[PDB]
Amino acid sequence: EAEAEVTLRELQEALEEEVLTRQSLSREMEAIRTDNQNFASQLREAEARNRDLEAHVRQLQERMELL
Amino acid sequence: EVTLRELQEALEEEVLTRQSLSREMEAIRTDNQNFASQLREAEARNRDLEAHVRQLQERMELLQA
Amino acid sequence: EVTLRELQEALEEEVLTRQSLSREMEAIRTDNQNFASQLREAEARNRDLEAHVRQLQERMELL
Numbered sequence A: 001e002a003e004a005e006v007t008l009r010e011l012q013e014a015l016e017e018e019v020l021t022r023q024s025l026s027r028e029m030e031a032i033r034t035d036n037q038n039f040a041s042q043l044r045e046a047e048a049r050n051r052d053l054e055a056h057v058r059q060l061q062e063r064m065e066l067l
Numbered sequence B: 001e002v003t004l005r006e007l008q009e010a011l012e013e014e015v016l017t018r019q020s021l022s023r024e025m026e027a028i029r030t031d032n033q034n035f036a037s038q039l040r041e042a043e044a045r046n047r048d049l050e051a052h053v054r055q056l057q058e059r060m061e062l063l064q065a
Numbered sequence C: 001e002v003t004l005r006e007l008q009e010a011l012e013e014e015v016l017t018r019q020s021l022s023r024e025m026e027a028i029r030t031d032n033q034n035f036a037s038q039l040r041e042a043e044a045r046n047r048d049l050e051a052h053v054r055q056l057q058e059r060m061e062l063l
Helices: A003-066 B004-064 C004-062
Strands: none
Touching: A003 B004, A003 C004, B004 C004
């Protein structure tokens, strides 16, 4: 060998470990992006459900006055 | 055996991939702040609607009475 | 020109940066969980209110 060759090969191994660790981070952030896409849809749906209920309550308020 | 330049290239490509992740994380934080605000808006519109429904229940009690 | 020394240092710097990113991800994973719990609570309150509205509608129709 040679001390320089050793250091080079150990550097490659350290880099490979870092890649594996970053790869796990990549999967974690991907779950985060899916969760976020879902939040966006859930909020939209909740917003529509409340507008539906608001409309129904307006109708009842109007019906209440009439009666 | 890996060479200096091959290691250098592999490191630069790892740095690029991670830099892409770092940029994505900016879009995530953006979204999170916006979603928090949207949730507070929804919470308030529901609290408002609760109060109207409570008032309707009270009006109905008065009319029944 | 590129030395083994410069590459070792460049990897250490990249490790530091990537570790800081991992912390941020950790903080957001926790955050997103607390958020989803708040969102489900809001969904539950709206479902409860829907039930109360139905009962009002039905009482109103009795008179």
